[PDB]
Design a protein around this ligand. Structure first.
Ligand SMILES: OC[C@H]1O[C@@H](O)[C@@H](O)[C@@H](O)[C@@H]1O
Ligand SMILES: OC[C@H]1O[C@@H](O)[C@@H](O)[C@@H](O)[C@@H]1O
Lengths: 142, 142
């Protein structure tokens, strides 16, 4: 169905029990090393701080970090690569009490402990070398 | 004027005296590290070999390489960064006898010696985190 704009920006609120659901596909083959980035921002401004930075180099690695008062903190690097060459992916990011949990196509794949309270989030941006068909933030919980 | 599709693909031929002219802008601020990539390919297929790979991490560095029978060769890394935060750029890549020369906004900025004859080029792709308003390959010379 219909392609969403990329870069994709949605005003957002997160707390324990929130889920962020993303369906998309890499624009090109893994040999060409397309990226995916998901940033949970503290303001609508793109230069604002990032509570949770998630950056996939498809076929190679994933880095997670925070950007706090304009400065990148301690990088976490994973070689875990559940994404499949040439395939649509479904990404879901759950806000648990102590961490973000990243599911890829239904499989727990990455976690990242909260450095800043999730309530600081005001915006989610999804960008780099993908098409997007679906984006949702859940708002069911108190 | 009118935005070209990104990723941008044009069938191309190059030889000594050819110029490739690119006008675009980074989609986001340099703090968010948008990329630009220009690949001179040996076939229309995106998985084909790359005679000249040019990859800008805006505000940080540039890497140049070739991908030959599916394998990346010796990386050349530059910290030269003439690109200006938030600005439109004009990139021109001249095919000289012994190298590619990269001009940024009229300023000689990078060169890369031919590893494969430029006549092997059949396609140029321009992609990653930019908008494009202009792309030209010159065809004036014998
Ligand atoms: O300069 C190093 C920093 O650069 C940024 O682009 C992110 O990749 C961070 O994860 C990293 O710590
Ligand atoms: O694996 C290392 C290689 O990876 C590719 O993505 C390019 O960046 C090459 O310049 C580099 O040599």
């Amino acid at each position: 169905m219909s392609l969403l704009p990329v870069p994709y920006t949605e005003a957002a609120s997160l707390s324990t029990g929130s889920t962020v659901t993303i369906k998309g596909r890499p624009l090109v083959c893994f040999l060409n090393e397309p990226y995916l980035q998901v940033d949970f921002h503290t303001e609508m401004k793109e230069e604002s701080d990032i509570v949770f930075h998630f950056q996939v180099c498809f076929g190679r690695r994933v880095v997670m970090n925070s950007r706090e008062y304009g400065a990148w903190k301690q990088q976490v690097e994973s070689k875990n690569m559940p994404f499949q060459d040439g395939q649509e992916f479904e990404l879901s990011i759950s806000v648990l009490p102590d961490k973000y949990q990243v599911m890829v196509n239904g499989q727990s794949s990455y976690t990242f402990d909260h450095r800043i309270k999730p309530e600081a989030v005001k915006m989610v941006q999804v960008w780099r070398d993908i098409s997007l068909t679906k984006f949702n933030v859940s708002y069911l919980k108190r």
